[PDB]
Design a protein around this ligand. Sequence first.
Ligand code: BNG
Ligand code: BNG
Ligand code: BNG
Ligand code: BNG
Lengths: 264, 334
Amino acid sequence: DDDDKMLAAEAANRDHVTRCVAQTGGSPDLVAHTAALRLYLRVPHFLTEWTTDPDRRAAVSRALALDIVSMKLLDDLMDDDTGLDRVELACVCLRLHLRALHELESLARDPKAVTDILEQDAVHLCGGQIRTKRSRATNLREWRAHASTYGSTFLGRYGALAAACGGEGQPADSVREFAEAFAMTITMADDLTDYDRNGERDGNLAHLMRTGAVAGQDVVDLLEELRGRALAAVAAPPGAPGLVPVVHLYTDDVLVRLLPRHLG
Amino acid sequence: VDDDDKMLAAEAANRDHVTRCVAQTGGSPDLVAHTAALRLYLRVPHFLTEWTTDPDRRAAVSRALALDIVSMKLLDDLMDDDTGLDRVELACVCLRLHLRALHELESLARDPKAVTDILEQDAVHLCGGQIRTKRSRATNLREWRAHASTYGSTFLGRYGALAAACGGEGQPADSVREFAEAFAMTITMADDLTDYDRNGERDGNLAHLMRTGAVAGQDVVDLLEELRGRALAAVAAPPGAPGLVPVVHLYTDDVLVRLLPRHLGEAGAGAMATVKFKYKGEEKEVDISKIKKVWRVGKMISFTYDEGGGKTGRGAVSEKDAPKELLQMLEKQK
Ligand SMILES: CCCCCCCCCO[C@@H]1O[C@H](CO)[C@@H](O)[C@H](O)[C@H]1O
Ligand SMILES: CCCCCCCCCO[C@@H]1O[C@H](CO)[C@@H](O)[C@H](O)[C@H]1O
Ligand SMILES: CCCCCCCCCO[C@@H]1O[C@H](CO)[C@@H](O)[C@H](O)[C@H]1O
Ligand SMILES: CCCCCCCCCO[C@@H]1O[C@H](CO)[C@@H](O)[C@H](O)[C@H]1O
């Protein structure tokens, strides 16, 4: 079945990454940390679901996993909250990033697309990240705007990328619309998921919900808007019907299990 | 007075390109100032682009290279967290710059995959090297030179490799890179022996081991001379970049004249200077440090010196057998 395929890609992606981190000098502690980024290693699978060839699909999924983890380490490096070596973080981050550009470029119909896609909205992504951390959100409007950069544009670039290294007949705008909508659903999920790991403060949105600054129904509505946006994206021909239940799994998880944890 | 102009121009060009970029992306006036303060970093893309016959390709490559070098410096500052700068801005401006760097370099590259190829060839060597460099402080010239070969030579070598790759025709890849690796270690020593007092900034590893006697002034001198030669040669390789010759001497001699002395002493490197002569059937050897009066008669240098107690000794040698230290005391006195 399909869950079988997702589980295998996740394990292939995980191994491609930890092997890479280990051979560049990352300690057992950082290797385990990259292996703990489950959704980050899984999402590249959903992102390459319009890729016909299984071999090309596995190569693109992992190349993308290499850069997603890389950017996620960059993030942990700017926050300094993981208690992981500052040096190993930077070093591994750059190493994984260079490996990803290399693999992705060798799979792209045209190597220049990789960097065109990366530069296209780099300012949007980076400046938004600066904006986001600079000022907390005070209501759903601001949260959502901050989230379309660290969440949506971030994932959206990888969608664009998968389309571009995913061979022929990949509806590029559609893979990206899925990427950005899905990214926001899981970004909320994480913001609302507390793990108790050290100096990890309440997730902004979760706080806004418990404070009352953000309306419960309003979150529900956004969730629904994001489910529709993604279902529409995967319905567009040629289609990726296989992502349909995935969109539902994640959107329904936040509605059923995460929201009740924050009704303030 | 004309090349120095081209350099001054590339340096401002590169600076403006980088600061304009850091600002558009959101960095605070602090970080825009900091990147601006990276003089050498912004300037060196000029020397790497010296084999580029077409001036516009050159301006373009020089600045792309500037963007990445600064980006990499920012990531280093980000791992040290000693700058006082905001980590978020550092990280974000870091990535932004690098992405812009990638795009611009690939646009001028001879082959679509050259850039990512170069950047990947020795990523593990540079990245794993950086981790070792920082986990263990060096303790002898040998260990310093090995650390420096990665965060200095390897680091700048890639930018050399990239300069040749995006620099049109007439680029001797290997030479460009060997220049970069040699020159890089030179300025890296210079940075190391240069103190600035900003924050809790460490005396440079090498300057420390030098003031501790763990490293020999003459050895440092030798190493600089090795790097000056390695460089000079790389710029001699046809088609050649005659223009980097004065540049090579400029920086090398700077470390020798100004920097080295701040860490050694009254006695530079090597051994003390001596005069060897034959006096009253004897064989004498005097330290120029003991030579009092010294004058010239024909092609003979006659002198007097301190021979123990209030005992005044004399001598005379052909100018040919006179050490440069003595031959100078002539000009001080006459
Ligand atoms: C991921 C690319 C799209 C951007 C949205 C980021 C959401 C990722 C959240 O996933 C979860 O993150 C936790 C900590 O961040 C991990 O403890 C957990 O194992 C992982 O499953
Ligand atoms: C993650 C890969 C690491 C690549 C980035 C390394 C930084 C490149 C330049 O090195 C610089 O050398 C100077 C001279 O010693 C130091 O004063 C300075 O701090 C350091 O920035
Ligand atoms: C060029 C990358 C290769 C690494 C070799 C180190 C050269 C960089 C040293 O230059 C100087 O660094 C200082 C930071 O400590 C700045 O304050 C100063 O203005 C700048 O001119
Ligand atoms: C310089 C631009 C870098 C963009 C940032 C790339 C990483 C994006 C993932 O964001 C993640 O969002 C989660 C949900 O809120 C947080 O739990 C987590 O801490 C944070 O890592």
